[PDB]
């Protein structure tokens, strides 16, 4: 299991010249020890596929994921949570390529497995609901999208913390859902909430002598990587309202924090 934890670490740094031969050589060892149809082979195929996807090698990523899926269905079972993790990775892959119609049934199968096996309260259910809502909104099917978001948000803040990265990602996705629907005020409210929580976690509780960035922006007008896209998207919302001095305050903060709207959907892996 140690090796699985080592590759993700090398991949996170963007060391593809080291991460890819690590997976390949590990898969070479496993196929000589326990053959092709073994759970550890499917685990390594799954991680390498995600490494390929990050390198824009989608053809390769799809091939390994479909292979890992067939292995996991055989070696672990059709209703195993590891099958749902691979089904999700396939849905996310199709979703990232615009194949929302093809991605939706895979996402629904993964959700059904995770609800039945882990319970309707598990963080992995919130993961699938978030991805399902993302695949639905990009099709223009808004019917149950906001319901999935508020359901996933409840699970994430309860099981993990309200400061957990999955909470901010799901919130940014719901705010993108509001933008696609022309709900500019609700998107503004949600982006302000993310920035308030980020301000409270670092500089403390909000008062007169300690205000979040968006509060200082509105004063001037009167006279985590997710936060950068939150700062940019709220800045663009102010620009649309004709509030340019408020828009400048956020752009200044987005520049310092780094080193129409920003379309970046946060899909949650495995």
């Amino acid at each position: 299991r140690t090796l699985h934890n080592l590759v993700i670490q090398y991949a996170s740094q963007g060391r593809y010249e080291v991460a890819v031969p690590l997976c390949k050589q590990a898969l070479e060892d496993l196929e000589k020890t326990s053959g092709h149809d073994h759970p550890d082979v499917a685990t390594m195929l799954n991680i390498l596929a995600l490494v390929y996807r990050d390198q824009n090698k989608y053809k390769d990523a799809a091939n390994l994921l479909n292979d890992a899926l067939a292995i996991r269905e055989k070696t672990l079972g059709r209703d195993h949570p590891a099958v749902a993790a691979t089904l999700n990775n396939l849905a996310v892959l199709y979703g990232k390529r615009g194949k929302y119609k093809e991605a939706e049934p895979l996402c629904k199968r993964a959700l059904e497995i995770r609800e039945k096996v882990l319970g309707k309260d598990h963080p992995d259910v919130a993961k699938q609901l978030n991805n399902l809502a993302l695949l639905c909104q990009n099709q223009g099917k808004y019917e149950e999208v906001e319901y999935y978001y508020q359901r996933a948000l409840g699970i994430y803040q309860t099981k993990l913390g309200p400061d957990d990265p999955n909470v901010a990602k799901t919130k940014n996705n719901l705010a993108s859902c509001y933008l696609k629907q022309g709900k500019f005020k609700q998107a503004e409210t949600l982006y302000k909430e993310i920035l308030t929580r980020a301000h409270e976690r670092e500089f403390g509780s909000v008062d007169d002598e300690n205000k979040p960035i968006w509060m200082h922006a509105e004063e001037r007008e009167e006279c985590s990587p997710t936060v950068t896209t939150t700062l940019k998207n709220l800045g663009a919302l102010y620009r649309r309202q004709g509030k340019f001095e408020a828009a400048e305050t956020l752009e200044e903060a987005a520049m310092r924090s780094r080193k129409v709207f920003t379309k970046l959907d946060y899909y949650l892996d495995d």
Partner: nanobody, 114 residues
Framework: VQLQESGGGLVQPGGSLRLSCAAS????????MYWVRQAPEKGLEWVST????????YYKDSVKGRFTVSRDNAKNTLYLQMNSLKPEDAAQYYC????????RGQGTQVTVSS
């Protein structure tokens, strides 16, 4: 996490109740809050959702325009104004940090009769 519900009672169809939920032991203002209900012989149903500040609200289709969720972050309290109450709304009501009813209190009984 400590949530305590109050405000339940017996009313006639068309009547009103205001549910309260006292919160302690957590950063309440950083959480989205939920109202959930369980009718005598049915499973737990989601009723309403409110964001941290109260700028975003959501309701079950059958309670839209009759129910109003609100919150007082300084008082660490969640509210549910229930107007034009119907027999279908008769249930045990709970407040929660999710739709499943995790961290819910003992609830409060709502009865709609005569």
């Amino acid at each position: 996490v400590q949530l305590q519900e109050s405000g339940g009672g017996l009313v006639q169809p068309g009547g009103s109740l205001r549910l309260s939920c006292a919160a302690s032991g957590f950063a309440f203002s950083s959480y989205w809050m939920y109202w959930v209900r369980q009718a005598p012989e049915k499973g737990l149903e989601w009723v309403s959702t409110i964001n941290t500040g109260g700028g975003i609200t959501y309701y079950k289709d059958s309670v839209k325009g009759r129910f109003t969720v609100s919150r007082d972050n300084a008082k660490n309290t969640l509210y549910l104004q229930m107007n034009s109450l119907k027999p279908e709304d008769a249930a045990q009501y709970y407040c929660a940090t999710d739709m499943s009813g995790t961290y819910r209190g003992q609830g409060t009984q709502v009865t709609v009769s005569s």
